[PDB]
C-alpha cells in the first residue's frame, strides 16, 4: 500500500488514487504576497475548553491523538466556516531534519513539522460522511519551528515510547489541545484536500500565520517512532509529509 518511501511515496499515489492530480489538492505553497486580505473573514473561533482526549495511536503513517466527538465538546467555527466543526483528532507531519517536515510551505519555506487539528462539519452526522462532502472537514494547520520547548506538547512527547510501532495505542485522557496553539490566530485559508490517500477534496484549510516553537529534543522524539509494526524491520517514522501541490484555480485568502 501507500507510504512515504521511494517506491510507495507521494509520486506514486495517483495510481491508486487518481484524485491525486485533482483541482483542489493539498498541501500548497502559501505565497504571502499573492494571498489576498479578505476583510469579510470572521474571526476564527476555537472552543476547546471542554475537549475530551481519549487515546493516542500510531497508525503507520503518523500518530493521532483522538478526542470524543460524540458531542459538541471541542469545536471550530467562524473564520471562513459556516456551521460547527467538531475536533476528532490531531496529528503531525515532520521531517528527518529540521529544515524540512511541513506539508504547507510559506514562500517556499519549509518548517520542521506541521500540526493538523482535524474537525468535521456536524451537519453531516459523522466523519465518514463528512469526508465525502466539499465542505466536510476543516483542518487547522500550525507550523512548528525548532527553538524553545513547547510545554503543552511534552505530554505527547513522553507517551511516544508506548506507541513506537504501527498499530500500538495508549490511553491519552485529559490532554488539553489549547496548549498547542500560538498566541495569534491570524490565518490563511483555501479549499483543498486530505494530504494523504484517499486525498479526498473535502477540506477547508485554515493555516495559522504564527508557528509554535518546540525544542530539538521534542522533535527528536518524533523521529524515533516507527512506520513498521513490531517485529518488522525498523523504518524510522520521518519525512511523512506530502510536498506542495499545484494551486491551480484557487486563491489563498488572508485574515490579516
Ligand atoms: N493530513 S490530513 O489531511 O489532516 C488527514 C486527516 C485525516 C485523515 C484520516 O483520518 N484518514 C483515514 C480515514 C479516511 C476515511 C475515513 C472515513 C471514510 C472514508 C475515508 C480519511 C483519511 C487523513 C489525512
Ligand atoms: Zn495531516
Curated annotation (Swiss-Prot):
Effect of residue 59 to L: Reduced activity
Regulation of protein activity: Activated by X-ray, histamine, L-adrenaline, L- and D-phenylalanine, L- and D-histidine, L-His-OMe and beta-Ala-His (carnosine).
Entry binding sites for substrate: 195-196
Effect the entry attributes to changing residue 62 to S: 2-fold decrease in enzyme efficiency, as determined by kcat/KM ratio, and efficiently inhibited by chlorzolamide
EC number(s) stated in the UniProt entry for this protein: 4.2.1.1, 4.2.1.69
GO molecular function, one term: zinc ion binding
Pfam families: Carb_anhydrase
Outcome following mutation: residue 198 to A: Normal CO(2) hydrase activity, but impaired stability
Phenotype for residue 59 to H: Reduced proton transfer
One of the GO biological process terms: regulation of chloride transport
CDD domains reported in the protein's UniProt record: alpha_CA_I_II_III_XIII
Record note on what altering residue 59 to T does: Reduced activity
Tree of life domain: Eukaryota
Subcellular location: Cytoplasm; Cell membrane
Disease: Osteopetrosis, autosomal recessive 3: A rare genetic disease characterized by abnormally dense bone, due to defective resorption of immature bone. Osteopetrosis occurs in two forms: a severe autosomal recessive form occurring in utero, infancy, or childhood, and a benign autosomal dominant form occurring in adolescence or adulthood. Recessive osteopetrosis commonly manifests in early infancy with macrocephaly, feeding difficulties, evolving blindness and deafness, bone marrow failure, severe anemia, and hepatosplenomegaly.
Summary of subunit composition and partner proteins: Interacts with SLC4A4. Interaction with SLC4A7 regulates SLC4A7 transporter activity. Interacts with SLC26A6 isoform 4 (via C-terminus cytoplasmic domain).
Name of the molecule in the record: Carbonic anhydrase 2
Native organism: Homo sapiens (Human)
Amino acid at each position: 500500500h501507500w507510504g512515504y518511501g521511494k517506491h510507495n511515496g507521494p509520486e506514486h499515489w495517483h495510481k491508486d488514487f487518481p484524485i491525486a492530480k485533482g483541482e483542489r489538492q493539498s498541501p500548497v505553497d502559501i505565497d504571502t504576497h499573492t494571498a489576498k486580505y479578505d476583510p469579510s473573514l470572521k474571526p476564527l473561533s476555537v472552543s476547546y475548553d471542554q475537549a475530551t482526549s481519549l487515546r493516542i495511536l500510531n497508525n503507520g503513517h503518523a500518530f493521532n491523538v483522538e478526542f470524543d466527538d460524540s458531542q459538541d465538546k471541542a469545536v471550530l467555527k467562524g473564520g471562513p466556516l459556516d456551521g460547527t466543526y467538531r475536533l476528532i483528532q490531531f496529528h503531525f507531519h515532520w521531517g528527518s531534519l529540521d529544515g524540512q517536515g511541513s506539508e504547507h510551505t510559506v514562500d517556499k519555506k519549509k518548517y520542521a513539522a506541521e500540526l493538523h487539528l482535524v474537525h468535521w462539519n456536524t451537519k453531516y452526522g459523522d466523519f465518514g460522511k463528512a469526508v465525502q462532502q466539499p465542505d466536510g472537514l476543516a483542518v487547522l494547520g500550525i507550523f512548528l519551528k525548532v527553538g524553545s520547548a513547547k510545554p503543552g506538547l511534552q505530554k505527547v512527547v513522553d507517551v511516544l515510547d508506548s506507541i513506537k510501532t504501527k498499530g500500538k495505542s495508549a490511553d491519552f485522557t485529559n490532554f488539553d489541545p489549547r496548549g498547542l496553539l500560538p498566541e495569534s490566530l491570524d490565518y490563511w485559508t483555501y479549499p483543498g484536500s486530505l494530504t494523504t490517500p484517499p486525498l479526498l477534496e473535502c477540506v477547508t484549510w485554515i493555516v495559522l500565520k504564527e508557528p509554535i516553537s518546540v525544542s530539538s529534543e521534542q522533535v527528536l522524539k518524533f523521529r524515533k517512532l516507527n512506520f513498521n509494526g513490531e517485529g518488522e524491520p525498523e523504518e524510522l517514522m520521518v519525512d511523512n509529509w506530502r510536498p506542495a501541490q499545484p494551486l491551480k484555480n484557487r486563491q489563498i485568502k488572508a485574515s490579516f
